[PDB]
Enzyme design. Structure first.
Site, short mmCIF file in Angstrom:
data_model
loop_
_atom_site.label_atom_id
_atom_site.label_comp_id
_atom_site.label_asym_id
_atom_site.label_seq_id
_atom_site.Cartn_x
_atom_site.Cartn_y
_atom_site.Cartn_z
N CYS A 32 1.25 -0.97 0.07
CA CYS A 32 -0.20 0.13 0.37
C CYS A 32 0.55 1.08 -0.05
CB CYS A 32 -1.18 -0.27 1.07
SG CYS A 32 -1.80 1.34 1.93
N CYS A 35 0.50 4.12 2.57
CA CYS A 35 0.76 3.48 3.87
C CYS A 35 1.89 3.69 4.16
CB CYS A 35 0.70 2.08 4.39
SG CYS A 35 -1.32 1.71 4.20
#
Ligand SMILES: [Cl-]
Length: 105
Positions: A32, A35
């Site tokens: 991700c 993230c």
């Protein structure tokens, strides 16, 4: 300091060990992008709010059965006080992250 939580038992024991401290959990995945962009800010927050407990969970470690990983979008931030979930939101929004810690502490 952020503690990496790699199992459900470690997760439950962390929430019990916190006592009256707010607990902030970053559920993230290693694939991700957003993230990655927020992760150093989450660690900076852990140095700043030194009486708040910061935990990080890689969702690839979540159990397939009886999991506490009750999330849908990455990153998800969940907030706990005395083992009870008191807040949650998803999205790498730095201001909302710090605002939520201040609302719940
Ligand atoms: Cl603090």
């Amino acid at each position: 300091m952020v503690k990496q939580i790699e199992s459900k038992t470690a997760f439950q024991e962390a929430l019990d060990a916190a006592g009256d401290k707010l607990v902030v959990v970053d559920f993230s995945a290693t694939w991700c992008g957003p993230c990655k962009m927020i992760k150093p800010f989450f660690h900076s927050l852990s140095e700043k709010y030194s009486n708040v407990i910061f935990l990080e969970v890689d969702v690839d470690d979540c159990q397939d059965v009886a999991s506490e990983c009750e999330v849908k979008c990455m990153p998800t931030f969940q907030f706990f006080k005395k083992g009870q979930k008191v807040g949650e939101f998803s999205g790498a929004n730095k201001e909302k992250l710090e605002a939520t810690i201040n609302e719940l502490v």
